[PDB]
């Protein structure tokens, strides 16, 4: 599932036994209820750049 | 950076400028507050081992704003496989003496897992890279903070698409080519050791660090990025271990 469109996760994407699939997210970010979007948890998160993010 | 523009000032928040004795010698990305990512080649010639500093939130050369942090570096960490002189496993993990503060203009690029960066961020087309490195082959360097958008090619396309020069190095699985062979567009002398970032669903990952060229945006050659990826799990077990005596560390790779 991984191997294909990144499992359809926006981050990091694990496989399991059969048709299993969990997305993750890098430290500073938090998987929503979607099991597949990540959402900052902190104020300078990785790779978001806060003059763009801001505006 | 030849053929770029000017990176707005706080677009690029990772890239990291490397001086020695106060003089310009590499780029570098932060990848979150106390490391740097860089290339193993910046230190070839390094004897001022103690006078290494690396500073972000830098835009102008010119003028001290309030944004630049300077942090001493503690500890150059190089694969044991690269040999100085030469430009296969081009890396280098930098530790910083203290965290560098997050800001709006000090932000860390985020290191990918290997997968998602061998199955996802290798397809992501274009990338940016960006330096204070020369602005021509045998130019003066920029003052302001450069950025160029460049793609990537698969390396049998890259050595396809290139013109025979004779002693040129080899582009090995730790390498990558990207960018242009009309000689308009490329890094250059300078920007070594400085990201290549990629775009992937609203968030940027280190996929490359500036490593080497034949002249810089000359007809018939691309610029050759050291394959991050490959150094993912290496990185990642160095960045859970204690600091150890002595600036340089040559670790074991894989
Ligand atoms: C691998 O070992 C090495 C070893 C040394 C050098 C190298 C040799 C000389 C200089 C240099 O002139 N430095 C100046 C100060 O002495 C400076 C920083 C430009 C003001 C700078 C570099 C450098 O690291 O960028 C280089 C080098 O020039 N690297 C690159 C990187 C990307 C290139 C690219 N994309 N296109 C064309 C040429 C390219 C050259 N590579
Ligand atoms: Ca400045």
């Not at chain 1, 991984?2 to 036994?17: A, F, K, L, P």
């Not at chain 2, 025979?164 to 890094?187: H, R």
């Not at chain 2, 810089?216 to 990025?225: E, S």
Request: aromatic share 8%; charged share 20%; net charge neutral.
């Amino acid at each position: 599932i991984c191997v294909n469109e990144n499992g359809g996760c926006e981050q990091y994407c694990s496989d399991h036994t059969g048709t299993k699939r969990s997305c993750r997210c890098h430290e500073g970010y938090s998987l929503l209820a979607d099991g597949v979007s990540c959402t900052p948890t902190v104020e300078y998160p990785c790779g978001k750049i806060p003059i763009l993010e801001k505006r | 950076i030849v053929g770029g523009k000017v990176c707005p000032k706080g677009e690029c928040p990772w890239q990291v400028l490397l001086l020695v004795n106060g003089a310009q010698l590499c780029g570098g990305t932060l990848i979150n507050t106390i490391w740097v990512v860089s290339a193993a080649h910046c230190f070839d010639k390094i004897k001022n081992w103690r006078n290494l500093i690396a500073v972000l939130g830098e835009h102008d050369l010119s003028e001290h704003d309030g944004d630049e942090q300077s942090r001493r570096v503690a500890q150059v960490i190089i694969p044991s496989t690269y040999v100085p002189g030469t430009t296969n496993h081009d890396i280098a993990l930098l530790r910083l003496h203290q965290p560098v503060v997050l800001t709006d203009h000090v932000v860390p690029l985020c290191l990918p897992e290997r997968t998602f960066s061998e199955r996802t961020l290798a397809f992501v087309r274009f990338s940016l890279v960006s330096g204070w490195g020369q602005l021509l082959d045998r130019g003066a360097t920029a003052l302001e903070l450069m950025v160029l958008n460049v793609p990537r090619l698969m390396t049998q396309d890259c050595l396809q698409q290139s013109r025979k020069v004779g002693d040129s190095p080899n582009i090995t699985e730790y390498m990558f080519c990207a960018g242009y062979s009309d000689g308009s567009k490329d890094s250059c002398k300078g920007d070594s050791g400085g990201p290549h970032a990629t775009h992937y669903r609203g968030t940027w990952y280190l996929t490359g660090i500036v490593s080497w060229g034949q002249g810089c945006a000359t007809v018939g050659h691309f610029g050759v990025y050291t394959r991050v990826s490959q150094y993912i799990e290496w990185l990642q077990k160095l960045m859970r271990s204690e600091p150890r005596p002595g600036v340089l560390l040559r670790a074991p790779f894989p």
